[PDB]
mmCIF file of C-alpha atoms in Angstrom:
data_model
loop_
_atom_site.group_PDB
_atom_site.id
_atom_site.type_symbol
_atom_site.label_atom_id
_atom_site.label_comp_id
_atom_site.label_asym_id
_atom_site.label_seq_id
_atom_site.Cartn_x
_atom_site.Cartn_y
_atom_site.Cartn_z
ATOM 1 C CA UNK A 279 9.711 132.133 119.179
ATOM 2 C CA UNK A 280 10.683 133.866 122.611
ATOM 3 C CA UNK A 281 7.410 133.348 123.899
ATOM 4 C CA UNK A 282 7.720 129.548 123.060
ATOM 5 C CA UNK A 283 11.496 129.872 124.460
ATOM 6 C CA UNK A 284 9.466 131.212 127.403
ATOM 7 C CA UNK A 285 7.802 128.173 127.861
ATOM 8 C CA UNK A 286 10.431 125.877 127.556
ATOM 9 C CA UNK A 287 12.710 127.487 130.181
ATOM 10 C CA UNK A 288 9.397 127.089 132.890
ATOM 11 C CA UNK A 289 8.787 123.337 132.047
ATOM 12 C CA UNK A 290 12.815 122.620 131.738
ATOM 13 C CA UNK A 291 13.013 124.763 135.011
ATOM 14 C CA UNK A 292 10.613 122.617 137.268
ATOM 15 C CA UNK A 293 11.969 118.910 135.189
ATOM 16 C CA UNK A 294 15.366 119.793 136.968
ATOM 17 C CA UNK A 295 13.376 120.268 140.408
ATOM 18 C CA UNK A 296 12.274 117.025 140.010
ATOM 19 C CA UNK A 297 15.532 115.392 139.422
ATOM 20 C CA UNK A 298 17.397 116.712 141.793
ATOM 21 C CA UNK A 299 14.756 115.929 144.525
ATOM 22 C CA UNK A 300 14.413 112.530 143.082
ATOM 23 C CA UNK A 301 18.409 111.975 143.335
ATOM 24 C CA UNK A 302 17.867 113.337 146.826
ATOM 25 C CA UNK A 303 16.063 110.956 148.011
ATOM 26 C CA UNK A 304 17.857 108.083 146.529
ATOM 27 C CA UNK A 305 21.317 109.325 148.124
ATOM 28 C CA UNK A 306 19.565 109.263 151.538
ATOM 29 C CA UNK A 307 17.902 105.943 151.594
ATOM 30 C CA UNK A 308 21.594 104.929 150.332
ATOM 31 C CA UNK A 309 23.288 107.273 152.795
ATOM 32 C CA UNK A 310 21.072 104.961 155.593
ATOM 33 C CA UNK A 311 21.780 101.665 154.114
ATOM 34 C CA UNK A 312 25.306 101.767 154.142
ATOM 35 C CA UNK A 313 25.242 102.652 158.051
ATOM 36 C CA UNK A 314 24.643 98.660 157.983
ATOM 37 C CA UNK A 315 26.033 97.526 155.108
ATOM 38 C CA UNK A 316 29.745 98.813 155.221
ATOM 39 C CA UNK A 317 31.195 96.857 157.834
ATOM 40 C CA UNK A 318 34.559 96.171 158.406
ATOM 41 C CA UNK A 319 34.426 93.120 156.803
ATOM 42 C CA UNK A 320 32.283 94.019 154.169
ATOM 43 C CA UNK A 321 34.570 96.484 153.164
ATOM 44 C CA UNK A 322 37.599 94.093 153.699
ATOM 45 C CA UNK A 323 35.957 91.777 150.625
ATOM 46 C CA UNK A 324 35.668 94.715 148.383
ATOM 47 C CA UNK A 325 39.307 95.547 149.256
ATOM 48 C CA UNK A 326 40.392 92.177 148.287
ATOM 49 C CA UNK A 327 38.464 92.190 145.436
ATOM 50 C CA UNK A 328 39.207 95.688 144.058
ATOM 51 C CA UNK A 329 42.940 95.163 144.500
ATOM 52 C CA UNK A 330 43.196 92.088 142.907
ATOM 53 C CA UNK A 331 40.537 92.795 140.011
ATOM 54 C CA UNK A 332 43.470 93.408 137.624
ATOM 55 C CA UNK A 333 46.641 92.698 138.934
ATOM 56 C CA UNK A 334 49.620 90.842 137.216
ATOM 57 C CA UNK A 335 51.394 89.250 140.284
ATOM 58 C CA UNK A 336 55.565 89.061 140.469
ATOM 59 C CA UNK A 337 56.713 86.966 143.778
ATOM 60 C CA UNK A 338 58.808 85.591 145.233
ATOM 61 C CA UNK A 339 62.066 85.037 147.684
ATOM 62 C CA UNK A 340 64.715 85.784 144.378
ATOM 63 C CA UNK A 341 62.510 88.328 142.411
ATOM 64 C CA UNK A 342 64.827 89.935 139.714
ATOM 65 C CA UNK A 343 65.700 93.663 140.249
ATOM 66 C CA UNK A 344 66.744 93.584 136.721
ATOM 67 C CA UNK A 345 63.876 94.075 134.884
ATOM 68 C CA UNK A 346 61.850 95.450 131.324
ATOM 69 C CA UNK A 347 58.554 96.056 130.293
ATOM 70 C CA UNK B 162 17.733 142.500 120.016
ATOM 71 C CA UNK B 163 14.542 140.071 120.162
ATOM 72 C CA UNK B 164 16.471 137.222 120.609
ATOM 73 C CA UNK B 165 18.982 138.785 123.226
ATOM 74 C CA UNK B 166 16.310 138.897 125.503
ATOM 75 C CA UNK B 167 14.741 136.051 124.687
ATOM 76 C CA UNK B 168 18.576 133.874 125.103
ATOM 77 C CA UNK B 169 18.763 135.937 128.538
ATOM 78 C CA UNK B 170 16.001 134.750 129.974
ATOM 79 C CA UNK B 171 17.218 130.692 128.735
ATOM 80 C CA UNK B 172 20.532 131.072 130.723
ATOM 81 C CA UNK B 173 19.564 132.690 133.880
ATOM 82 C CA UNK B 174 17.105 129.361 133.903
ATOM 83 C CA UNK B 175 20.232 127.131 133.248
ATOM 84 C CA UNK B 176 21.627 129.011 136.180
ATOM 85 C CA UNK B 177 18.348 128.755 138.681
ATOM 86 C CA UNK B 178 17.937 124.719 137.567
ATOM 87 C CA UNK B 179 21.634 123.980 137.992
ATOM 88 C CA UNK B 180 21.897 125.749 141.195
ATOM 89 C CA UNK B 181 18.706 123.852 142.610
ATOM 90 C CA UNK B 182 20.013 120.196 141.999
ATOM 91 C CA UNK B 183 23.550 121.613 143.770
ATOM 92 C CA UNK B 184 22.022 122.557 146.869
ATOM 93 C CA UNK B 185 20.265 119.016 147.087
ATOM 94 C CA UNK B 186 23.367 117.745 146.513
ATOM 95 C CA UNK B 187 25.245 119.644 148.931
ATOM 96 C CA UNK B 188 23.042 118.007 151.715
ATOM 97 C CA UNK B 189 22.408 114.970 150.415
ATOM 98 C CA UNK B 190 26.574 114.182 150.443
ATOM 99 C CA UNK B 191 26.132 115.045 154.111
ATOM 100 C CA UNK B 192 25.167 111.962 155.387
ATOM 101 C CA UNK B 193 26.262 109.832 152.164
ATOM 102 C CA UNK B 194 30.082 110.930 152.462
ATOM 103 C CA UNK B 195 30.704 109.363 155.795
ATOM 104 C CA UNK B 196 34.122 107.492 155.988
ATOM 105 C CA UNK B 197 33.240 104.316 155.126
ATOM 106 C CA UNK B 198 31.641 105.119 151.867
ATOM 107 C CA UNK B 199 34.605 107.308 151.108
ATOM 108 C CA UNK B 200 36.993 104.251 151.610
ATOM 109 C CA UNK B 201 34.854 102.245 149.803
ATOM 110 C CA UNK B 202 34.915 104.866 146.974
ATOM 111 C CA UNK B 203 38.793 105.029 147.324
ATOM 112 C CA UNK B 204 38.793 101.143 146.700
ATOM 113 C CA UNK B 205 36.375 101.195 143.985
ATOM 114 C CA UNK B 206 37.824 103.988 142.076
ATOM 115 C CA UNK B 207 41.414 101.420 141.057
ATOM 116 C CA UNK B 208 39.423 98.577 139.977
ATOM 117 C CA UNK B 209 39.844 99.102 136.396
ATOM 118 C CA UNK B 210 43.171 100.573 136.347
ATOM 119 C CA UNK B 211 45.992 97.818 135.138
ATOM 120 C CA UNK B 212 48.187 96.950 138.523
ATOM 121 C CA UNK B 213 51.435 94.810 138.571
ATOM 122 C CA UNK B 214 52.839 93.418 141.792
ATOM 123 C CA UNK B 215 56.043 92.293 143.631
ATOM 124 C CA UNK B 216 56.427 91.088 147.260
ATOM 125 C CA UNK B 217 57.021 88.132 149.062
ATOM 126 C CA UNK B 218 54.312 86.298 149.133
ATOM 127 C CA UNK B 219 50.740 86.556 147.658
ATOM 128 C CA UNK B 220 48.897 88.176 150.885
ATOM 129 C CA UNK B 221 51.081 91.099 151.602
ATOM 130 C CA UNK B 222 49.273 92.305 148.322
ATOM 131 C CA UNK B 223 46.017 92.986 150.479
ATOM 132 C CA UNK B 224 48.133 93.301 153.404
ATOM 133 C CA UNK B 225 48.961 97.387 153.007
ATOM 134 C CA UNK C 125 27.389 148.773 102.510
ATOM 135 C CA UNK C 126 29.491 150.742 105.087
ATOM 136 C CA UNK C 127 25.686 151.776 106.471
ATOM 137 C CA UNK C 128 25.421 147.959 106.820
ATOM 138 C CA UNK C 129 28.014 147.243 108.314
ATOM 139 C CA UNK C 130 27.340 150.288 110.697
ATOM 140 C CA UNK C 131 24.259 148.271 111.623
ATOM 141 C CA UNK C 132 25.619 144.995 111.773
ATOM 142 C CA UNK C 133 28.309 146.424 114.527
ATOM 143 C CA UNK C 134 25.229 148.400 116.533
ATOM 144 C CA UNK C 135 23.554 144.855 116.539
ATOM 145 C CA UNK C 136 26.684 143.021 117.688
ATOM 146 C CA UNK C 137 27.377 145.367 120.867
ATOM 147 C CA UNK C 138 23.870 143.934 121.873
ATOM 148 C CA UNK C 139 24.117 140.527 121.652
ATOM 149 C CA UNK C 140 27.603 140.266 123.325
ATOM 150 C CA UNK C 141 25.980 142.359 126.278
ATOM 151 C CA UNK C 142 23.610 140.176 126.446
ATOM 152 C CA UNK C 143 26.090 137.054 126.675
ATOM 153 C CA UNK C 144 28.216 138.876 129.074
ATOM 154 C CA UNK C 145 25.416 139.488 131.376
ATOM 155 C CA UNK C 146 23.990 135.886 130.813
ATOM 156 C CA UNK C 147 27.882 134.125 131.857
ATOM 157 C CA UNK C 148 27.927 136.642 134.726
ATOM 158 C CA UNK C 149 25.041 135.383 135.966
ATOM 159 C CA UNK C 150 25.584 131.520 135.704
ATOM 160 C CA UNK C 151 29.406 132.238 136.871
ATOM 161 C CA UNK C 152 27.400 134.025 140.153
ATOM 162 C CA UNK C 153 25.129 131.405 140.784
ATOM 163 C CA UNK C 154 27.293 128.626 140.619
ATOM 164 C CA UNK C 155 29.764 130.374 142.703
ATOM 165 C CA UNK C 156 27.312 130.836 145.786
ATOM 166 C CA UNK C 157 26.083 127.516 144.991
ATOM 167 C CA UNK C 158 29.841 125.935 145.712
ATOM 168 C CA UNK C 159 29.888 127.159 148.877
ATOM 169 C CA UNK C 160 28.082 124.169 149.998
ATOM 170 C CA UNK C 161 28.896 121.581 147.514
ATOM 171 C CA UNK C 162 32.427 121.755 147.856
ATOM 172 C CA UNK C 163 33.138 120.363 151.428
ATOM 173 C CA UNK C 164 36.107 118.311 152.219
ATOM 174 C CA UNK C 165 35.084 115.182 151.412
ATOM 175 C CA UNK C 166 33.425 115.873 148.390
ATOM 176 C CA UNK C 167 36.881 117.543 147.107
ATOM 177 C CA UNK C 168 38.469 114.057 148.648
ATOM 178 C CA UNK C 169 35.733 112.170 146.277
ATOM 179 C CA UNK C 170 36.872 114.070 143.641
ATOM 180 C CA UNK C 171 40.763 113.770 144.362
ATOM 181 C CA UNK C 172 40.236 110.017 144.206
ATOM 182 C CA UNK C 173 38.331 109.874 140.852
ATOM 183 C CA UNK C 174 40.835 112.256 139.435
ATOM 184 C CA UNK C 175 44.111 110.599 140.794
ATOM 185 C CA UNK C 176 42.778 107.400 139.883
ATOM 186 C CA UNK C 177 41.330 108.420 136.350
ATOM 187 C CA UNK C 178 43.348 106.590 133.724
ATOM 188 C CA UNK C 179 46.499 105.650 135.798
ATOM 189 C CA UNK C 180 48.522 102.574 135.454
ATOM 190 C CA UNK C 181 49.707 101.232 139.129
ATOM 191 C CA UNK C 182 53.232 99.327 139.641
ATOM 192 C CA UNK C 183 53.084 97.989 143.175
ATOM 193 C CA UNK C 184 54.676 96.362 145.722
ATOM 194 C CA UNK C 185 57.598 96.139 148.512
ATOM 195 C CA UNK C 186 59.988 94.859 145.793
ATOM 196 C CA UNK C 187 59.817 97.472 142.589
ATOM 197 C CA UNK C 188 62.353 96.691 140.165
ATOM 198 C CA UNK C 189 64.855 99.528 139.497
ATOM 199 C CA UNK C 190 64.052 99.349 135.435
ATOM 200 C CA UNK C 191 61.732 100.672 132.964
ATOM 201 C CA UNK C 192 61.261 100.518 129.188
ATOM 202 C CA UNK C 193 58.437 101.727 126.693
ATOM 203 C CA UNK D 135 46.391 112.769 131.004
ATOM 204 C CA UNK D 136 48.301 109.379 131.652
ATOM 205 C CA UNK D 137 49.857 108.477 134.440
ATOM 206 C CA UNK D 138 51.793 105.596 136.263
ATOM 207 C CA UNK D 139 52.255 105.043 139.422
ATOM 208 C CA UNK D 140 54.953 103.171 141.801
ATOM 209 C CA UNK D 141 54.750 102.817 145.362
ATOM 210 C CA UNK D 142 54.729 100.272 148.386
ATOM 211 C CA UNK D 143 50.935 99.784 148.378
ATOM 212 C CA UNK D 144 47.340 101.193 146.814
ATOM 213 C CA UNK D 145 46.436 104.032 149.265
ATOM 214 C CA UNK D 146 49.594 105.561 149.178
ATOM 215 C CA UNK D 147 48.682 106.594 145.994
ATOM 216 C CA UNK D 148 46.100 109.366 146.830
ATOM 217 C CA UNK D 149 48.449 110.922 149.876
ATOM 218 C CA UNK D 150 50.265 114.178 149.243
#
């Protein structure tokens, strides 16, 4: 059995390698495409959208101090 | 004591495999964590979360 | 049974030396590892996530001055 | 653990 556990630690050992150099290279063709992608306007949309993704909305000119939840 | 050494040997893999993928990670946030992204992030990371609002009018909400 | 439990104790010192050793190790490693992982903006990544992790947000120029729950 | 938050706008959330 620690021969076999042997074996299993050098094939777990070089699956890890892989996935980390896989991830890698995914977070640097991202890294790249953002250079275009986030704009300032781009990133004014997801603004918008993240802030009002959930929001209840009070307003008004005579909004009540008073208040309970 | 056979399966001391045989446990040893697991863990100082963990170690070596972990380590690897934190190095690659390490550079790869180099580039990826520029400003932009990390505003983005900063955006993305309060979508979920339950917001309530008061102002004036609807687009001093967006408006920080 | 004392004699086993004699042997039982010589077998234990073992296999929490071998633990020890094992944590000291992985505690090593992913220290030196850190040193590189843990940059500003990563930690500001994190700060986000963490801050933002299960949080309920009340805002707005005009907060009322009540609560209830 | 939970949290709420109050404040004028979003990003002043994550400034210390």
């Amino acid at each position: 059995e620690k021969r076999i556990s042997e074996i299993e630690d050098a094939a777990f050992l070089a699956r890890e390698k892989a996935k980390a150099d896989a991830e890698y290279y995914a977070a640097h063709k991202y890294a790249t495409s953002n250079k275009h992608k986030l704009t300032p306007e781009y990133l004014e949309l997801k603004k918008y959208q993240a802030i009002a993704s959930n929001s209840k909305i009070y307003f008004g000119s005579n909004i009540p101090n008073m208040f309970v939840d | 004591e056979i399966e001391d050494a045989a446990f040893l040997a697991r863990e100082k893999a963990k170690a070596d495999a972990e380590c690897y993928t934190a190095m690659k990670i390490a550079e790869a946030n180099k580039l990826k964590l520029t400003p932009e992204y990390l505003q983005l992030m900063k955006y993305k990371a309060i979508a979920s979360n339950s917001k309530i609002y008061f102002g004036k009018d609807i687009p001093n909400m967006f408006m920080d």
